Design a protein around this ligand. Structure first.
Ligand SMILES: CC(C)=CCC/C(C)=C/CC/C(C)=C/CSP(=O)(O)OP(=O)(O)O
Ligand SMILES: [Mg+2]
Ligand SMILES: [Mg+2]
Length: 499
């Protein structure tokens, strides 16, 4: 059947990767495996290969290579795994003063590799800032008169690099483009085609159960004003992590992201502040007895929240790890502590200071709750230390919420401001000094780049936790970039399979 064919292809690819252990073919094969959405099948072998590459790196046993593609791909592959390889290997190509050599203008492959490698630099990284402008200029110059199978890659990359691109949609696009390339591998492409079909089948199957749970719930029939966002809540928990072993982790969190959104609306689109200051204490206490005095719709919403939380506790109690949900309840404690502040600013007719507003909005984005609540379905990574680290609000969690808040704000500050809503970041920054809407938008756009550069730094080897746990903030930051660029996502990532 398909599974035996997939296993045979997996062993074939393992044998080839072993046989190319010393050449650039290893780098190309690892890159193609990662970009085809099958990188998780070869975690151990890829880790060993990258360890060997790092050991023979740093000019200790490294042969000088003039190929921009080879060194750029090596740097990008090593930086994606954690190794702190210095961004100084690009000094060789900066021969003509501080500008890159002109002989690379016509090298579209090396230019694109440098383009994708440059975005992975950190704040302290050098030689990875003017490269973006260089490659942008030359790729735009050479785009109109370029051949189709590589102009497709150029057009796919100019919109967003691999750093800011969700992995599943980019994997689909690369599988679609890789057919036209004449230097491809047939077995790797077939393996990716089979794996994509199986993972898409699993992803489509889970949505059926989630929709069944929503239908059986009391949420949709009553409380009419809630806007149904079940699909756009699964796709946000589909690009965070899509591996099959995390399937149990995608049911439990998506069920609790519709509840955390319904709550946002309950606090801003409507409701009076007197009535909202009694919801916060009810959430903090976390008992059904606190629901007696609440209004009907808040009572129903928080009762459903309590029911789903206790149901999830019952499920994690089989393996003796129910106490993890003793950390989720605390997280929901802070979120309502942030929603209840902004509403007050709505009623007091006050414009918060930018720093205070940003500090409050980092918790009112629910990216801090979504980083704690994603550990529910992790088998061995979910430990007490991991949950304590996640609750302690590390810098990695903070820098993935900056992008959310600041991008949303810029996009959705016109629909709500007409009605009674909390002042957004652009209005807060226009409050001090004197700036226009566009000049404040550019200021708020100059912060997303620094947030991305700060998020790139946290995923290195000086890490308190594992790589699987730290990968989540990066994917959370990538999902706001896909939205603010969606029936195409549903129709050709979940409905239309790959031939
Ligand atoms: C599918 C989707 C968009 C969200 C589900 C997951 C969440 C909660 C993501 C982060 C928060 C965002 C971007 C809310 C947009 S609605 P808003 O701008 O009205 O929220 P606000 O009141 O401004 O915080
Ligand atoms: Mg709102
Ligand atoms: Mg807003």
């Amino acid at each position: 059947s398909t599974k035996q064919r997939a296993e045979m292809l997996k062993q074939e690819v393992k044998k080839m990767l072993h046989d190319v252990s010393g050449s650039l073919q290893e780098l190309n094969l690892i890159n193609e495996i990662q970009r085809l959405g099958v990188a998780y099948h070869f975690e151990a072998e890829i880790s060993n290969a990258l360890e060997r590459i790092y050991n023979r790196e740093k000019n200790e046993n490294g042969i000088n290579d003039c190929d921009l593609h080879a060194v750029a791909l090596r740097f990008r592959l090593l930086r994606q795994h954690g190794y702190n390889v210095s961004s100084d290997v690009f000094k060789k190509f900066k021969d003509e003063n501080g500008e890159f050599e002109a002989r690379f203008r016509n090298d579209v492959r090396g230019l694109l590799s440098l383009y994708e490698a440059a975005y992975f630099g950190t704040q302290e990284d050098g030689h990875l800032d003017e490269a973006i402008a260089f490659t942008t200029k030359h790729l735009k110059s050479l785009l109109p008169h370029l051949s189709s199978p590589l102009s497709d890659l150029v057009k796919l990359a100019l919109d967003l690099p691999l750093l800011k691109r969700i992995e599943r949609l980019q994997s689909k696009h690369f599988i679609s483009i890789y057919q036209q390339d004449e230097d491809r591998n047939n077995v790797l492409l077939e393996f990716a085609k089979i794996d994509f079909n199986i993972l898409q089948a699993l992803h489509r199957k889970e949505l059926n159960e989630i929709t069944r749970w929503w239908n059986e719930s009391d949420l949709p029939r009553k409380l009419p004003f809630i806007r149904d966002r079940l699909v756009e809540c699964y796709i946000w928990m589909l690009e965070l992590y899509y591996e099959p072993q995390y399937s149990q982790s995608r049911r439990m969190t998506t069920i609790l992201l519709i509840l955390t959104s319904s709550m946002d609306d309950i606090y801003d689109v409507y409701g009076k502040l007197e009535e909202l200051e009694r919801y916060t204490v009810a959430v903090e206490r976390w008992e059904r007895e606190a629901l007696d005095q609440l209004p009907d719709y808040m009572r129903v919403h928080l009762g459903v929240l309590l029911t789903v939380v206790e149901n999830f506790e019952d499920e994690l109690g089989k393996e003796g790890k129910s106490f993890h949900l003793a950390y989720v309840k605390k997280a929901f404690a802070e979120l309502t502590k942030a929603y209840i502040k902004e509403a007050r600013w709505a009623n007091a007719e006050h414009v918060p200071a930018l720093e205070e507003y940003v500090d409050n909005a980092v918790v009112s984005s629910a990216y801090p709750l979504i980083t704690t609540m994603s550990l529910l379905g992790m088998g061995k990574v979910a430990t007490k230390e991991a949950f304590e680290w996640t609750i302690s609000l590390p810098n990695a969690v903070r820098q993935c919420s900056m992008i959310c808040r600041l991008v949303n704000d810029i996009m959705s500050n016109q629909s709500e401001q007409e009605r009674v809503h909390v002042a957004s970041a652009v209005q807060c920054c226009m409050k001090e000094f004197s700036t226009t809407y566009e000049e404040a938008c550019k200021i708020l756009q100059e912060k997303i780049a620094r947030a991305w550069k700060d998020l790139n730094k946290e995923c290195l080897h000086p890490i308190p936790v594992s790589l699987e746990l730290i990968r989540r903030p990066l994917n959370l930051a990538r999902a706001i970039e896909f939205y603010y660029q969606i029936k195409d996502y549903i129709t050709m990532l979940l409905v239309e399979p790959a031939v």
